[PDB]
Amino acid sequence: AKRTKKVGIVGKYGTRYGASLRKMVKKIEISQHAKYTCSFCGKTKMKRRAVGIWHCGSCMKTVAGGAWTYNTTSAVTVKSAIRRLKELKDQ
Amino acid sequence: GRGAPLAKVVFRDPYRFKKRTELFIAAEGIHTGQFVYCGKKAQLNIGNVLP
Amino acid sequence: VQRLTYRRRLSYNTASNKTRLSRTPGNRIVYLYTKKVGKAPKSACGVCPGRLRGVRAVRPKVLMRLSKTKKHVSRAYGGSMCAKCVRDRIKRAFLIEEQKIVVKVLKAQAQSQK
Amino acid sequence: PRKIEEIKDFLLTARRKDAKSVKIKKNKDNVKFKVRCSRYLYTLVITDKEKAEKLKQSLPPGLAVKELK
Amino acid sequence: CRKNTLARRKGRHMGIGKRKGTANARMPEKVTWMRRMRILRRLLRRYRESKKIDRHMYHSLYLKVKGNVFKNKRILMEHIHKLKADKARKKLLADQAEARRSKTKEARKRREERLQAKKE
RNA sequence: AGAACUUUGAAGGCCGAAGUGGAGAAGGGUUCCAUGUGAACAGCAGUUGAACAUGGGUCAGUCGGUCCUGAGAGAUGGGCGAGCGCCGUUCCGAAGGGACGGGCGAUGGCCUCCGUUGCCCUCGGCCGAUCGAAAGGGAGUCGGGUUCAGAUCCCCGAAUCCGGAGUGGCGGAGAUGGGCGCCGCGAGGCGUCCAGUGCGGUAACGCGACCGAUCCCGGAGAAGCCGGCGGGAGCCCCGGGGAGAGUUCUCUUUUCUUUGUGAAGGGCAGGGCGCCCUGGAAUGGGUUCGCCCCGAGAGAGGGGCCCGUGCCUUGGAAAGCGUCGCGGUUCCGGCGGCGUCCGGUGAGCUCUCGCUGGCCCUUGAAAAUCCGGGGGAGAGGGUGUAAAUCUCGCGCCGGGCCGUACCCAUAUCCGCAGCAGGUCUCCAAGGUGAACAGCCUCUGGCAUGUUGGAACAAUGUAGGUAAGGGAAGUCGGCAAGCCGGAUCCGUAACUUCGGGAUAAGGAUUGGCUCUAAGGGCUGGCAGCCGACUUAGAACUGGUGCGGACCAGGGGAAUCCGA
RNA sequence: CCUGGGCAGGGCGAAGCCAGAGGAAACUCUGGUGGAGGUCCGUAGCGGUCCUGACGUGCAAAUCGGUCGUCCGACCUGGG
Ligand SMILES: [Mg+2]
Ligand SMILES: [Mg+2]
Ligand SMILES: [Mg+2]
Ligand SMILES: [Mg+2]
Ligand SMILES: [Mg+2]
Ligand SMILES: [Mg+2]
Ligand SMILES: [Mg+2]
Ligand SMILES: [Mg+2]
Ligand SMILES: [Mg+2]
Ligand SMILES: [Mg+2]
Ligand SMILES: [Mg+2]
Ligand SMILES: [Mg+2]
Ligand SMILES: [Mg+2]
Ligand SMILES: [Mg+2]
Ligand SMILES: [Mg+2]
Ligand SMILES: [Mg+2]
Ligand SMILES: [Mg+2]
Ligand SMILES: [Mg+2]
Ligand SMILES: [Mg+2]
Ligand SMILES: [Mg+2]
Ligand SMILES: [Mg+2]
Ligand SMILES: [Mg+2]
Ligand SMILES: [Mg+2]
Ligand SMILES: [Mg+2]
Ligand SMILES: [Mg+2]
Ligand SMILES: [Mg+2]
Ligand SMILES: [Mg+2]
Ligand SMILES: [Mg+2]
Ligand SMILES: [Mg+2]
Ligand SMILES: [Mg+2]
Ligand SMILES: [Mg+2]
Ligand SMILES: [Mg+2]
Ligand SMILES: [Mg+2]
Ligand SMILES: [Mg+2]
Ligand SMILES: [Mg+2]
Ligand SMILES: [Mg+2]
Ligand SMILES: [Mg+2]
Ligand SMILES: [Mg+2]
Ligand SMILES: [Mg+2]
Ligand SMILES: [Mg+2]
Ligand SMILES: [Mg+2]
Ligand SMILES: [Mg+2]
Ligand SMILES: [Mg+2]
Ligand SMILES: [Mg+2]
Ligand SMILES: [Mg+2]
Ligand SMILES: [Mg+2]
Ligand SMILES: [Mg+2]
Ligand SMILES: [Mg+2]
Ligand SMILES: [Mg+2]
Ligand SMILES: [Zn+2]
């Protein structure tokens, strides 16, 4: 069945620590405990290690990623800007 | 004690027949098996430390 | 139900003082010590985890007593590579050598055209 | 404690010098020969009493022999 | 205590008033589930080894035993009897319909051969 | 001489496996043990003691220190300081005395040829001397017996490691093959030439051994906590057998005790495998309690590896144990017979191995040591004759220094003492029960905690009841008492929607007969063999049922602090 | 700071998963499995609230007895 209606993953804390804090911890605990699809092997076995380290069960290929998700949107912006300024007139 | 993840990049030493091992701060988006290019005229991508 | 005790003058249940229990010929439950388990040498350099096959797995200083069959595999890169690394590195080295020959003769043909 | 199976290899080992003692033990269903050479106790188990008697007959004479009960 | 334990095995001294832990403490839910589902998940193998159920319906009943549908071995066997008796009826009726279709296609192709021979 | 206390017997008790038990670390220092005394000390006494006096007792290549580094501490170089000195641990330093081969030279032994020494060439980061753990790292020993006191040390028997062996102990590999031509019937031999730094399996890998230097690479050493689950052991439990003991008023094929195989080697179970081959899968399939896995190769079949602490074998029945007898005063680890069996079950306990998962802005030690691999400078017999070498099987020699007694505590330590205080760990049975809860027994200890006798006044200190009323007492429901376990019902206001909540309130609970359900193993749906749980029914006891022990009063509100 | 050691049973039942029912979709409902928590009753352990209980020239220059708080942790603890 559906055992909780709102708290989702944050129900392990209970009635303490505060509403907005649980609300803001929800949206990134789901991110850090979610399995991600590896861009290398194509399986869905990414798992977060210690902070900043991501690991896939197949092929043991360990990628330095974001602290809570797999890619920071700012980091994707920086990578697009780096390839643009790369092929901009060859330095 | 450091929030940054720490990369262990191995180099070839051009003077003694020996591999040397250094410790770089892991730039966002490198992974085990990506080559790291460093030097003056090194091409510009993520991880490539250059002047 | 015979309660039984350490034989040495240790007391603390350390990692080194790790014990089992047996039965004497003299009809008595005694408390016999145990050498620690020696994990096998694991694979060379970054590959999928798993110890190297066909190696007598012991503590380090045990390896002085052992003969020169039970420490290595008959293959080249015996007790270091896990043989999937061997059948990768051979193909990798050969193909990179062939690509270097192709790039070198391409430079030669480019200079011939120029 | 090592176990010998052939009579030949046992006998050669018995004549292999600095083996100082042979015990002979009789049993309900078999008979055993103990050789105390060095670093080891060489046991030959055999079930045929006639073979044991002819082996002890052909046993080398300078070596000590002790029967156990 | 041997006399008392034989009285326990009869089923005496075991009402409400001489229990003190909960039912989940006396015989746990996880233990009930492990025993129950190891029994039901090896009975399906004992059928699948022989021929009691084919490879495709094995997986459906495997998931339906993983889900809390079947309580025990007897009603599992009663339900496998019903599914097998349903599959046999449906395959019999389909084979009879395919026999009728084979008769009609045979007759049509033979009539086409008859008209071909009337042409040549 | 003397007995409320000493010792023995009998009886009744306690500690009740998280102990008043069996042993240790730190500490104590002879208290350990025997003999003798009872003057003082033990707060009464004492024939006794941890008191006094005499005399004994601590045996180790394989137990630990020694060795390694950790948190750190500390010296020279350097700097500072009136100055004993301080700072400082790579910083401002010429901080390696070693080796490989080669050459020149010398010396000595069997001057064959080995062994030294001097010089020269080549090579060689030390992230720095040295110290730092009787719980971290660290090769290698277990069983039986033995004393008034020892014990993995003494003995008996069985093993193992580390070194060393130069004229290289003894064997085995390296190793002896093939062609040519001739002779010989042939078997073989002659002569010439050539090879020979091992072999097998498609693999995963295997065998008894398998030349290797400077150097380089890697692994082991080397990893947290918590869940689950599987195997193995030990213990407990059940059924049958065998020895001995108890009960027999009446019954009880009854109750209890006892019922063994060391390290090391070989083999076989078993478990695990991210380890290979054949082979292509979707109507998706395989598997866990949970997951998880699959074209980067699932299922299926066949192979391979590791742990093998389990079983068998060697040790090993000669011992050990139980029991029944026979001899020697003693001195005998005497002597002899008999036996030391079968099986089964398990959310059972405890330990360990392995798998997998969860948790993290915690990522969970370093080094001595040892090994493998990459490379191939070199080394060696050159042929009918054998070496360079060897981590293989045997054989020889040695393993130095120190600690080792005992308490480890309601009497050997600290606390001014034989002081309810304090102090670090291991093993831990049966029943009830959820359980290591509390209560009662068994192994194993013990005399009630620095005294006894007589009587049962007050006040006490700990405990327990009370007719009626139920907070009226008192600053105050302080104290004590009520509910208390489980099952089945039922659960509000409020709210961060997770709770509140075991809310509040009810009922039921015993003994004894059953009934129903919940499984394993066999065979071409049927036959044998078993676990402890749940639901229901009847009978019945003086309304009695968590019967002792175990054990939440509750609600309504306010203030403050998440 | 380093190196080791230690913590019985149970109640509450999140994420993830499975099955069934409904829905056109979004998704919802029901029964299991699952075992998270600076989580709840409670053992050892650690503290010391109340009785202003015992003692108060004591057993003791801070103890004892009931009654207590917390026990996977910002936990407890030995040695260096
Ligand atoms: Mg559950
Ligand atoms: Mg008298
Ligand atoms: Mg007394
Ligand atoms: Mg008692
Ligand atoms: Mg004790
Ligand atoms: Mg006195
Ligand atoms: Mg005396
Ligand atoms: Mg004494
Ligand atoms: Mg004295
Ligand atoms: Mg010895
Ligand atoms: Mg040692
Ligand atoms: Mg100094
Ligand atoms: Mg100076
Ligand atoms: Mg040191
Ligand atoms: Mg140690
Ligand atoms: Mg002995
Ligand atoms: Mg002793
Ligand atoms: Mg040697
Ligand atoms: Mg197990
Ligand atoms: Mg063995
Ligand atoms: Mg079992
Ligand atoms: Mg001692
Ligand atoms: Mg005391
Ligand atoms: Mg005390
Ligand atoms: Mg224990
Ligand atoms: Mg018990
Ligand atoms: Mg029970
Ligand atoms: Mg007495
Ligand atoms: Mg006393
Ligand atoms: Mg009254
Ligand atoms: Mg009354
Ligand atoms: Mg009333
Ligand atoms: Mg008032
Ligand atoms: Mg009170
Ligand atoms: Mg009352
Ligand atoms: Mg309330
Ligand atoms: Mg409370
Ligand atoms: Mg207000
Ligand atoms: Mg507060
Ligand atoms: Mg809590
Ligand atoms: Mg509460
Ligand atoms: Mg309580
Ligand atoms: Mg407590
Ligand atoms: Mg206390
Ligand atoms: Mg206190
Ligand atoms: Mg107090
Ligand atoms: Mg007071
Ligand atoms: Mg007084
Ligand atoms: Mg609590
Ligand atoms: Zn991957």
XYZ file of C-alpha atoms (C1' of nucleotides) in Angstrom, chain F residues 129-331:
203
model
C 70.405 8.839 13.806
C 67.948 6.568 17.840
C 63.371 5.631 21.093
C 58.105 4.586 21.396
C 52.703 -1.078 22.316
C 54.020 -7.528 28.079
C 46.035 -5.709 24.230
C 48.123 -3.089 17.329
C 51.992 -5.784 13.087
C 55.123 -10.032 13.989
C 57.643 -17.311 10.913
C 57.356 -21.565 14.140
C 53.917 -26.999 19.605
C 50.254 -29.977 20.376
C 48.671 -34.552 23.283
C 49.603 -38.049 27.749
C 51.956 -38.320 32.544
C 54.574 -36.201 36.608
C 55.239 -32.828 42.440
C 54.023 -31.314 49.513
C 54.592 -26.359 45.648
C 55.840 -26.479 38.146
C 53.716 -26.823 33.304
C 52.319 -25.569 26.014
C 59.064 -25.126 30.264
C 60.410 -31.450 33.625
C 59.682 -36.522 31.360
C 57.265 -39.909 27.380
C 55.714 -39.726 22.492
C 54.592 -37.025 18.054
C 55.884 -32.358 15.015
C 57.440 -27.651 13.077
C 60.241 -23.033 11.978
C 64.643 -20.056 11.384
C 69.713 -19.918 10.114
C 74.458 -22.523 8.432
C 76.961 -26.140 5.482
C 82.693 -23.784 2.246
C 86.647 -29.932 -0.752
C 79.365 -27.726 -2.788
C 76.291 -34.784 2.581
C 72.922 -38.334 -0.502
C 69.389 -38.920 -4.358
C 65.925 -36.397 -8.228
C 65.301 -32.713 -12.041
C 68.433 -29.645 -15.625
C 69.284 -35.262 -19.140
C 70.355 -37.233 -22.474
C 67.020 -36.763 -28.361
C 67.147 -36.951 -33.604
C 69.258 -37.286 -38.495
C 73.226 -39.018 -41.625
C 76.886 -42.926 -43.134
C 78.994 -47.756 -41.966
C 79.021 -52.589 -39.745
C 75.993 -56.105 -37.459
C 70.239 -61.095 -39.266
C 68.769 -58.521 -35.357
C 69.680 -56.584 -30.561
C 73.516 -52.501 -30.546
C 78.018 -50.134 -31.589
C 81.177 -46.952 -34.404
C 82.144 -42.106 -36.554
C 80.209 -37.199 -38.138
C 76.697 -33.172 -37.752
C 72.817 -30.821 -34.922
C 69.420 -29.760 -30.833
C 68.564 -29.753 -25.638
C 68.034 -22.977 -19.524
C 60.990 -28.746 -18.143
C 56.412 -30.558 -19.611
C 50.760 -31.218 -20.231
C 45.001 -28.976 -20.752
C 41.088 -24.791 -26.271
C 40.855 -22.384 -21.747
C 40.082 -21.338 -16.229
C 44.878 -24.017 -14.712
C 47.719 -28.497 -13.179
C 52.995 -31.600 -11.826
C 57.986 -32.823 -7.170
C 61.807 -29.319 -9.371
C 61.317 -25.589 -13.949
C 69.095 -20.709 -14.371
C 68.495 -15.218 -13.273
C 71.763 -9.291 -11.688
C 71.415 -3.840 -11.140
C 66.441 -1.752 -11.841
C 61.016 -1.234 -12.198
C 55.670 -2.573 -11.212
C 52.210 -4.999 -7.995
C 50.099 -7.741 -3.966
C 50.105 -9.410 1.074
C 51.010 -7.100 5.711
C 45.920 -3.587 5.820
C 40.943 -2.546 7.879
C 34.739 1.123 10.371
C 29.747 0.171 12.744
C 25.050 -2.191 12.221
C 21.701 -5.530 9.809
C 20.046 -10.024 7.764
C 21.074 -15.071 5.856
C 23.832 -19.942 4.888
C 27.522 -23.680 6.408
C 30.696 -25.860 10.171
C 31.989 -26.738 15.177
C 31.002 -26.966 20.761
C 26.930 -27.081 24.194
C 21.866 -28.208 25.114
C 17.540 -31.604 23.532
C 15.210 -36.592 21.772
C 15.026 -42.179 20.588
C 17.676 -47.072 21.005
C 22.076 -49.952 22.955
C 26.266 -51.050 26.931
C 28.703 -50.448 32.192
C 28.062 -48.442 37.453
C 24.972 -46.052 41.246
C 19.965 -44.539 43.540
C 14.353 -45.887 44.517
C 11.232 -50.200 45.049
C 4.922 -49.155 50.651
C 2.521 -49.371 45.789
C 3.826 -48.486 40.175
C 7.933 -47.142 37.090
C 11.799 -51.791 29.949
C 12.524 -46.326 35.587
C 16.077 -41.888 37.367
C 21.200 -40.231 37.336
C 26.628 -40.551 35.918
C 29.721 -42.062 31.947
C 29.790 -43.181 26.526
C 37.688 -40.171 23.037
C 41.113 -38.928 18.899
C 46.062 -33.496 19.204
C 49.327 -30.455 15.758
C 51.155 -31.792 11.263
C 50.607 -34.611 6.245
C 47.248 -37.087 2.472
C 42.314 -37.779 0.771
C 37.003 -37.123 0.678
C 32.418 -34.336 2.085
C 30.548 -29.536 2.293
C 30.410 -24.275 1.161
C 32.016 -20.150 -1.825
C 33.711 -18.144 -6.627
C 33.148 -10.943 -10.354
C 36.666 -18.591 -13.254
C 36.707 -20.895 -18.484
C 34.396 -23.597 -22.764
C 29.986 -25.029 -25.733
C 25.769 -22.209 -26.530
C 22.026 -17.946 -28.029
C 17.515 -15.722 -24.671
C 11.585 -11.356 -25.207
C 5.255 -14.985 -25.052
C 11.065 -12.047 -21.272
C 13.713 -15.422 -18.327
C 16.894 -17.037 -13.566
C 17.059 -16.540 -8.451
C 16.934 -13.874 -2.510
C 13.988 -13.454 3.680
C 15.557 -8.887 0.996
C 17.595 -8.398 -3.383
C 19.609 -8.596 -7.519
C 21.454 -10.563 -12.717
C 21.074 -10.741 -18.205
C 23.634 -9.471 -25.406
C 29.804 -5.963 -21.875
C 26.366 -13.207 -22.663
C 20.734 -15.239 -18.740
C 19.026 -20.373 -18.435
C 21.068 -25.404 -19.503
C 25.272 -28.835 -19.914
C 30.463 -29.722 -18.987
C 35.060 -28.106 -16.572
C 38.544 -25.005 -13.126
C 40.100 -22.591 -8.399
C 40.024 -21.449 -2.877
C 38.675 -22.441 2.251
C 38.572 -26.706 3.805
C 38.466 -25.708 11.845
C 33.715 -31.058 9.300
C 34.526 -36.954 8.145
C 38.241 -41.002 7.101
C 43.348 -42.330 7.149
C 48.789 -41.795 9.530
C 49.701 -40.214 15.000
C 46.467 -44.435 17.645
C 45.329 -47.435 21.742
C 50.671 -49.155 23.462
C 48.102 -44.607 25.848
C 43.179 -41.816 28.403
C 38.358 -42.950 30.704
C 34.660 -46.333 33.026
C 34.079 -51.001 35.249
C 35.480 -56.021 37.097
C 39.170 -58.809 39.492
C 44.672 -60.491 40.673
C 49.720 -59.645 42.840
C 53.958 -56.745 45.137
C 54.474 -53.202 52.789
C 56.631 -49.658 49.811
C 59.520 -48.683 45.497
